[PDB]
């Protein structure tokens, strides 16, 4: 009978997060007498995973009598934090029991899905033809390999920068990406999309969206005119506030620098591009000024004179 050998037939095992991992180990001899123990890591600070003779290991279960020679284990509910190299080790009986021979080790790698991509646009709004940044973020996947793409309404974008961290080794990875997007006057109904592809994903990439309606500001055009009034000594003066977004607009009517009336747009019409239209009118050497404050921005105004 040849001397006891500890045999770990698998150099590496790959498990999906949440599943059970099987770590195989068989010993060739029953002598010398002593327990088999499982560890993660070797040398300094190795972690006891299972002890055949005593203790509680709820996650550990035996995969196989006194002539038992198979010491394979199963570990339930795997997480990325279980990744590492596992060693099956034979000890000689004693108090305490001394180490005798170690298996060659089995590397356990764990597969985790990326989290749903979160897309954030800038803090303040911008007008058409401005460039704005969007950030995309996804965490906790392994392996490190991943693919990130950006789209604006279906067209893939190219102007972006991506980072995966750690650059070094870890159990889970994160991805962070920033894309530069040029706003047009048609973006109220537009959407920016960040999609990630990973092996743990059954064909369909995870997507994160951001609606440009939250980011765009389209300033109103003003137009002040005068209408025929039946009664004499009266003129209908109108201000048309057209094609604006969002719908937050305050309008003050002025008479030679004197506040005649203030108003908030309440019932607007909508255009095909998602912007709104509104109009205010009042019955009146004299100047009339239609003064507008759109979405908390600096007042703009058109002035008009009396017949
Ligand atoms: C002033 O003109 C507007 C725009 O045509 C109209 O809707 C409004 O009713 C007019 N005011 C009066 C008193 O007719």
Report how far residue 216's alpha carbon sits from residue 186's, in angstroms, rounded to the nearest whole number: 10
**Same domain assignment for residues 235 and 196:** no
Q: Does any ligand 1 atom lie closer than 6 A to the CB of residue 240?
A: no
Q: Is the peptide bond before 166 cis (omega within 30 degrees of 0)?
A: yes
Cα end-to-end span (Å), the chain: 120
Documented resolution in Å: 2.5
What are the structure tokens assigned to 174, written together? 């994160």
Q: What is the CATH number of the domain that holds 301?
A: 2.60.40.10
What domain range is 293 assigned to? 220-306
**Same domain assignment for residues 161 and 199:** yes
**Same domain assignment for residues 213 and 225:** no
Of 83, 112, 141, the one marking the end of a domain is 112
Say if CB 239 and CB 290 are below 8 A apart.
Answer: yes
Specify which residues 88 forms β-bridges with: 38
Residue 52 neighbours by CB under 8 Å, 6+ apart: 35, 36, 37, 71
Nearest CA to ligand 1 atom 1: 236
**Same domain assignment for residues 200 and 239:** no
Of 59, 77, 112, the one marking the end of a domain is 112
Q: Please count the other Cβ atoms lying within 10 Å of the Cβ belonging to residue 271.
A: 14
The secondary structure of 256-283 as a DSSP string is TTEEEEEEE--S-EE-TTS-EEEEEEEE
Q: Does any ligand 1 atom lie closer than 6 A to the CB of residue 238?
A: yes
Number of domains forming the structure of the chain = 3
**Same domain assignment for residues 225 and 275:** yes
**Same domain assignment for residues 46 and 82:** yes
**Same domain assignment for residues 211 and 236:** no
Q: Is the peptide bond before 306 cis (omega within 30 degrees of 0)?
A: no
Of 43, 78, 112, the one marking the end of a domain is 112
Residue 129 neighbours by CB under 8 Å, 6+ apart: 182, 183, 184
**Same domain assignment for residues 21 and 81:** yes
**Same domain assignment for residues 86 and 136:** no
**Same domain assignment for residues 129 and 214:** yes
Report how far residue 134's alpha carbon sits from residue 59's, in angstroms, rounded to the nearest whole number: 43
Considering only CA atoms, which of 67, 59, 66 is closest in space to residue 22? 59
Q: Where is 154: in which H helix or E strand? A: none
Q: Choose one of 228, 238, 253, 290 to mutate for the ligand 1 pocket test, by most ligand atoms within 8 angstroms of C-beta.
A: 238
Residue 227 neighbours by CB under 8 Å, 6+ apart: 235, 236, 237, 238, 281
């Amino acid at each position: 009978e040849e001397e006891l050998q500890v045999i770990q037939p698998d150099k590496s095992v790959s498990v999906a997060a949440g599943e059970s991992a099987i770590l195989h180990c068989t010993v060739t001899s029953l002598i010398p007498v002593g327990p088999i123990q499982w560890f993660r890591g070797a040398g300094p600070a190795r972690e006891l995973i299972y002890n055949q003779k005593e203790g509680h290991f709820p996650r550990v279960t035996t995969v196989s009598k006194r002539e038992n020679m198979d010491f394979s284990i199963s570990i339930s509910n795997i997480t990325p934090a279980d990744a590492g190299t596992y060693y099956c080790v034979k000890f000689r009986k004693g108090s305490p029991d001394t180490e005798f021979k170690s298996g060659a080790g089995t590397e356990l790698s764990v597969r985790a899905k990326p989290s749903a991509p979160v897309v954030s646009g800038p803090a303040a709004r911008a007008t058409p033809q401005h460039t704005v940044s969007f950030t995309c973020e996804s965490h906790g996947f392994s392996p490190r390999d991943i693919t990130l793409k950006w789209f604006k309404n279906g067209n893939e974008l190219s102007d972006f920068q991506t980072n995966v961290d750690p650059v070094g080794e870890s159990v889970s990875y994160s991805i962070h990406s920033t894309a530069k997007v040029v706003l047009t006057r048609e973006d109220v109904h537009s959407q920016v999309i960040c999609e990630v592809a990973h092996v743990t994903l059954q064909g369909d990439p995870l997507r994160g969206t951001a609606n440009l309606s939250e980011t765009i500001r389209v300033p109103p055009t003003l137009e002040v005119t005068q209408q025929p009034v039946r009664a004499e000594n009266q003129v209908n003066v109108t201000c048309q506030v057209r094609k604006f977004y969002p719908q937050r607009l305050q309008l003050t009517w002025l008479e030679n620098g004197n506040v005649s009336r203030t108003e908030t747009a309440s019932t607007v019409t909508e255009n095909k591009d998602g912007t709104y239209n509104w109009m205010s009118w009042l019955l009146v050497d004299v100047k009339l000024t239609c003064q507008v404050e759109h979405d908390g921005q600096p007042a703009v105004s058109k002035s008009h004179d009396l017949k």
